Design a protein around this nucleic acid. Structure first.
Lengths: 103, 78, 93, 97, 93, 108, 81, 97
DNA sequence: TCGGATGTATATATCTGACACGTGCCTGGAGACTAGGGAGTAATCCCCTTGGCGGTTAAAACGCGGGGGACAGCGCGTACGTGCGTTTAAGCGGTGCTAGAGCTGTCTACGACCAATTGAGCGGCCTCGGCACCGGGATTCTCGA
DNA sequence: TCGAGAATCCCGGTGCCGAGGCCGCTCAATTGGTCGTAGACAGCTCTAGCACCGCTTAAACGCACGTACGCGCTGTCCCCCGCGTTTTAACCGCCAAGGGGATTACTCCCTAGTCTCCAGGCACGTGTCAGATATATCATCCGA
């Protein structure tokens, strides 16, 4: 019955519709806008989580921590471009030493 | 005098994480100036949000909004 | 009562990695990322609807906002998934 | 005896603080600095723990990014040692000054 | 159709500031673009301020806080003094 | 019904208050809009316009020009510190640049 | 069609832009560097301008599309529109 | 016979192009380049003259700010001639690379 | 370039406190049904964008000295690392306690909405004055002496 | 220093086009009511921010010591600038057309609004194991 299962998604289409209606974005909100936005959000979340799981596995760890999210975001050209101006707390930095400093 | 609590080794450690090999002496003050300016800019908007909210405590959401206003979005606190 | 995306972010994680877990700090970061992207796309769609003297956010506005926001391959894949989801939603009544 | 040659320990501690995710700054001194700065805007202010922590995480990330740009500005001048003019150039180009 | 522009009011302000100074069409268009940009900037900041505090109305205090947040230094200290002085004059019919 | 008195003249302003109320109501900013919000916003906008026009007219007078052109607006905005900070990510069309030659380049 | 019009941004035009920028002496590779920086900037702006145009179901790129595309990247051109 | 020395005819024209408010780029070549670039996004587009003018103003403002930062970077390295590495450093610090 | 000696990974016991899982319930999401207004489709108008040809000439492309600045190499001395001894204050784990953050119940004043009413501002039309342009004279810089 | 020579400013005269004022008239701002509800105000609770205190010990600080690197100086040369000549294509004007961007008209169907029902996800509690820590066991780098 839930619109998330009717569209084959996992994010809540109903909650997204409620937030779109109560968010002061437009006078009225269409019927497929929540479905489209929930699909896009779920796709981006899946991309982030699949990239962070690889980083967590490369560290012999079965749990995702902020450092793994930072590695996944900074090692992807497009995710780092979408989140260029974002700071991840407890995420550290990307290991990068300039060649000039090396002996 | 609390700006001296940001010691020389702390600035050196931040530089090392930033990939720095050698540091001049005047950096340990040129960096305190920048840190103080940045903190003043962020805390001004945080306290503005706090005052508008009719509150006397600065919640983490006020700092998050003040940072998001300056382009430095922060993930992890709300 | 406070509403978060923890349940859905955890379900997606079980989809993509059935053998890994996610910490509390990472869940907070994922909620802050989802909220930020939602706000970005919704604001862009609102501005798009305002520019054209319309008063309705539709799949057209959300798709154009996604194309404007996300980079090339990310935007193309997001548009494809959104169109597929809208089509499935519509046909299944 | 085994004085690690000048520059070699400096090569280290970079691989140490880029692998770690800690704060690198003492927390009570930073809280005191935050309160002293905030006195100039409103008296008798109380701060939330998640607010001082948020300020610390934001400021340290800002300083690390500034030092990353400053190192490039210093390498550009065919140098290895950062001088304050390198910080001023980075701030001016970034738009802060 | 009729396009609305702040030309009349900007010209009135110019003539009360500089009685014997004109203004070209391109400078008038730039002043209209500046006024629109600042209007939308302050209005968006006030909307976000109202949303953050779970309010449902934009009062003069949200505009005051938006002006304080957006205008730098001595400019905000003077703009707040004009806004309050105008609101006081308004509410004494 | 009495004689019609505009809200922008009752408050003493020159910018319109009814138009600002209408733009705040049809702008999807909030569900409701208070009575004093348009007055405050119109006063702020009028002050900010007068502040720029003062320096623009001053710049025009310094150039022996009766009328204000975009070059004078750019000269007014870039010279003043706070106007430059407010409009630092803004491009004024046909405004040129502020004359600034670096001291190193000058001849000896 | 149209091809290789990036050379229409001649060397004198780049030198005049540098002179207005306050540059006293120019190298010989600055021209090729600038003709590749300008192309990237123009592609980035025109992608969003054409997106705005296509959304409105139009075939002409109006000045408002360019203004909105510029404001999207935080550049806020005053003047047109 | 009266030849100006290499370091004067160039500050001259610096003063000239900083005093003026012109475009400094030919208009037909820029329009042609804009159309060529836009062919990759939608075939058979009809640019509005105001759009082509706004594109030119924005592009030259960007190229003047970039050259200001390039001049600053080239002066930082104790040089007068701007090099492509100066442009690279300016864009890297600005956050465009 | 191997000998001595540091500072990383590697392997194992041992907690423990976050993580994932029952649970139940209550609030928000479905499901049906109605009204009406946004917008989608059709047709039309005209305006403004594309396309073209001719004449000027301002500007770009070219080629040639030549000087000045970028680059490389040498040298010096200083200031910034490296390590050792100390001492200073940061954590940490308790205590108490009290401001004030957060949630609830009235109920009152304020903002939305609607129905005439009209004057402010938007559109169209001169027009003369501010500004651009040219011609020449006076003023200022410049560079080889 | 000095004066010929080029660049620039000033001063005036002429033309020209747009900034500004005036008239007509819409339609959006004003006035005056009702009505519903958002939040102002008082009040209560409980929680977490603050203050303190002892103790341990990790980190900061100060001081030799040395070496390597930033900065100044000198020499080369090469490459960029100033200038004169030759294209050349921008640019202005003036024409023609037709594509499509703005309008209105109509109607229809899609979304808001409301009532009713129910399920899922949000606090809450609990076992338990992923990972952090103490302890012992090979890449590299410093010196003849």
């Amino acid at each position: 019955k839930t619109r998330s299962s009717r569209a084959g998604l996992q994010f809540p289409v109903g909650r997204v519709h409620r937030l779109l209606r109560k968010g002061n974005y437009a006078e009225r909100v269409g019927a497929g806008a929540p479905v489209y936005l929930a699909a896009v959000l779920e796709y981006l979340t899946a991309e982030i989580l699949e990239l962070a799981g690889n980083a967590a596995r490369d560290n012999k760890k079965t749990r995702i921590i902020p450092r793994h999210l930072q590695l996944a975001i900074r090692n992807d050209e497009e995710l780092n471009k979408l989140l260029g101006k974002v700071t991840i707390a407890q995420g550290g930095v990307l290991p990068n030493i300039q060649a000039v400093l090396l002996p | 005098d609390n700006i001296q609590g940001i010691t020389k080794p702390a600035i050196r450690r931040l530089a090392r994480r930033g990939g720095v090999k050698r540091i001049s002496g005047l950096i340990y003050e040129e960096t305190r100036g920048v840190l103080k300016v940045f903190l003043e800019n962020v805390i001004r908007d945080a306290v503005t949000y706090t005052e508008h909210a009719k509150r006397k405590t600065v919640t983490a959401m006020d700092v998050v909004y003040a940072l998001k206003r300056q382009g430095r979005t922060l993930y992890g606190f709300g | 009562r406070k509403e978060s995306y923890s349940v859905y972010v955890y379900k997606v994680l079980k989809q993509v990695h059935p053998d890994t877990g996610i910490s509390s700090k990472a869940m907070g970061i994922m909620n802050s990322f989802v909220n930020d992207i939602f706000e970005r796309i919704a604001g862009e769609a609102s501005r798009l609807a305002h520019y054209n003297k319309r008063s309705t956010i539709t799949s057209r506005e959300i798709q154009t906002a996604v194309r404007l926001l996300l980079p090339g391959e990310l935007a193309k894949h997001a548009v494809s998934e959104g169109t597929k989801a809208v089509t499935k939603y519509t046909s299944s009544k | 005896p085994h004085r690690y040659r000048p520059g070699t320990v400096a090569l280290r501690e970079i691989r140490r603080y880029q692998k770690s995710t800690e704060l690198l700054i003492r927390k009570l001194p930073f809280q005191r600095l935050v309160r002293e700065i905030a006195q100039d805007f409103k008296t008798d202010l109380r701060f939330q723990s998640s607010a001082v922590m948020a300020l610390q995480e934001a400021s340290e990330a800002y300083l690390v990014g500034l030092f990353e740009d400053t190192n490039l500005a210093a390498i550009h001048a065919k140098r290895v040692t950062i001088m304050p003019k390198d910080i001023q150039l980075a701030r001016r180009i970034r738009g802060e000054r």
